[PDB]
Design a protein around this ligand. Sequence first.
Ligand SMILES: C[C@@H]1O[C@@H](O)[C@H](O)[C@H](OS(=O)(=O)O)[C@H]1O[C@@H]1O[C@H](C(=O)O)[C@@H](O[C@@H]2O[C@@H](C)[C@H](O[C@@H]3OC(C(=O)O)=C[C@H](O)[C@H]3O)[C@@H](OS(=O)(=O)O)[C@H]2O)[C@H](O)[C@H]1O
Ligand SMILES: [Ca+2]
Length: 260
Amino acid sequence: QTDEDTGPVVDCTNQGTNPTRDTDIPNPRNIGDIDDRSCYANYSESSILGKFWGIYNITDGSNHMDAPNTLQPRIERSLSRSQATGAGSYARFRGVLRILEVGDTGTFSSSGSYFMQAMGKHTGGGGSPDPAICLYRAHPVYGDDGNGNQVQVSFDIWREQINFRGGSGSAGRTEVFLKNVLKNEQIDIELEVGFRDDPNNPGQTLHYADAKIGGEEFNWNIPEPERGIESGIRYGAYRVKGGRAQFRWANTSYTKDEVN
Ligand SMILES: C[C@@H]1O[C@@H](O)[C@H](O)[C@H](OS(=O)(=O)O)[C@H]1O[C@@H]1O[C@H](C(=O)O)[C@@H](O[C@@H]2O[C@@H](C)[C@H](O[C@@H]3OC(C(=O)O)=C[C@H](O)[C@H]3O)[C@@H](OS(=O)(=O)O)[C@H]2O)[C@H](O)[C@H]1O
Ligand SMILES: [Ca+2]
């Protein structure tokens, strides 16, 4: 059984030209509020591999909601942010991911697509008014299909992370490789963003974004814990500067705790 889009890559389709960002189906199984900024597809679900999957498909140039030539297309769900900075504060997302395709431009720095991200505002200015903290970006790995064609067969997952609050661009962010996953392989995902007691320090605090991907932990401390005011997560599909991205999410859960 299959839920993969295989037709030509186009910018918009009727079935995906939603009138508002909050266009959703009745009773979605994925948790969180829909934020649909792509006219290629809408959120929908499929029943396969013994699970119910939310379907996040976006294509290059399909953002009919943001002002043109600004932000990339996306279909995401946003989760209530943890608006506290005490140790023990966290946002915790869990789910099962399938990757079927990501964007590709032929150059690493503009290739790949995000399936989740950690974000949170900070004091003191710097960057955009709703700044990213780090995003989890999947890049294509090609191989043969069995008939002499190069196609996406696996995906290198990298973390695009801030060097400093609100950082963007070559100077503002660094890319860290995490691990490879196979096309259509079911991957357990956990992402927890939060504040904890700093051991190397007293009564100071660390702001972290710790992921578990297919059983392996990738932990990371956010720069300048003291400037951050909240922890937030979004997931789905975001960024496709060439071609198409297709993410599948099953059994999503979200918890948070706010501790001062
Ligand atoms: C800032 C956004 O943050 C998140 O939301 C998300 O990761 C997003 O990624 S995205 O979905 O792929 O878009 C981030 O968006 C990128 O933000 C960059 C930014 O800092 O605003 C954008 O880069 C800026 O603009 C670039 C054009 C510039 O790159 C130089 O400029 C030109 C050009 O005008 O011809 C081309 C080349 O990009 C490069 O020569 C960036 O400069 S830098 O060299 O990287 O430091 C930067 O000014 C980026 O386009 C957004 O996608
Ligand atoms: Ca849509």
